Amino acid sequence: KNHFRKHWQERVKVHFDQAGKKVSRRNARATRAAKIAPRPLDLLRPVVRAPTVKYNRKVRAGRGFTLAEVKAAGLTAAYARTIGIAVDHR
Amino acid sequence: GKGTPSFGKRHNKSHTLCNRCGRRSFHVQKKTCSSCGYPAAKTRSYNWGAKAKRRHTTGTGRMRYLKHVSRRFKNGFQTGSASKA
């Protein structure tokens, strides 16, 4: 079963830029680090448990800390964002 | 006869020089150019006519103003005059 009864040749994409894209990403990261020199370049993320029991056994990183978690930690969501702590209201 | 005698009466003219392009494609009866689309505001062009597009695409002519835009952008569209050291 092969799906090639279309003009697939017009949509063929070859990732020649794999090395070039990697170099650009590394250069971009360094550029931001220079721009973000005082900060660690990323926001701390929470501990999260996954759905889909096939994966719930493994802990995973979340998008951001909940409002209740931030409040219990002894700060505020607005201050947390400026301090570098990811916040997720959902 | 459809042969050579028919060609004898070929003394009239259907097309004429076009004001916009002057390619001799301005029809007299229709008062329109079949090549550049005159007098229609939009220049006539089509994707199926790849060769036709090249013959009239930008850069084929003089490019009196567009040719200098790159240098001005490189200089940041600076204004004034040189400080002379």
Binding site: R39 | F77, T79
Partner: protein, 119 residues
């Protein structure tokens, strides 16, 4: 050979006009000799001198007009920036910096802080 632009810059408008008239007369006289002489390369210098005088006069007039419109809003378009159509219509520096009072208060209260993970 040829009229120097800086020398002309020190002359007055009437002097520039007189010099232009004299150069035009000289160019006309030389052209009469060109059709007789086998070759008259000297004609090139006077033709460019006329252009230099005209450019100097135009520059002086434009600079005078600029003073006539110095600091006045809604000035002649030709004196305005020639950057490009898109940039001309783009929001100005002040317009792009417009921030609502709510956002101003939010930024003032909680501006981005400089923090490092050291201890």
């Amino acid at each position: 050979a040829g009229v120097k632009a800086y020398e002309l810059r020190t002359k007055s408008k009437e002097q520039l006009a007189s010099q232009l008239v004299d150069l035009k007369k000289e160019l006309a006289e030389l052209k009469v000799q060109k059709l007789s002489r086998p070759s008259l390369p000297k004609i090139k210098t006077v033709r460019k001198s006329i252009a230099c005088v005209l450019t100097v006069i135009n520059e002086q007039q434009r600079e005078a007009v600029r003073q006539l419109y110095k600091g006045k809003k809604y000035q002649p378009k030709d004196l305005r920036a020639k950057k490009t159509r898109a940039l001309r219509r783009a929001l100005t520096k002040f317009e792009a910096s417009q921030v609502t009072e709510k956002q101003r208060k939010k930024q003032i209260a909680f501006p981005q802080r400089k923090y490092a993970i050291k201890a």
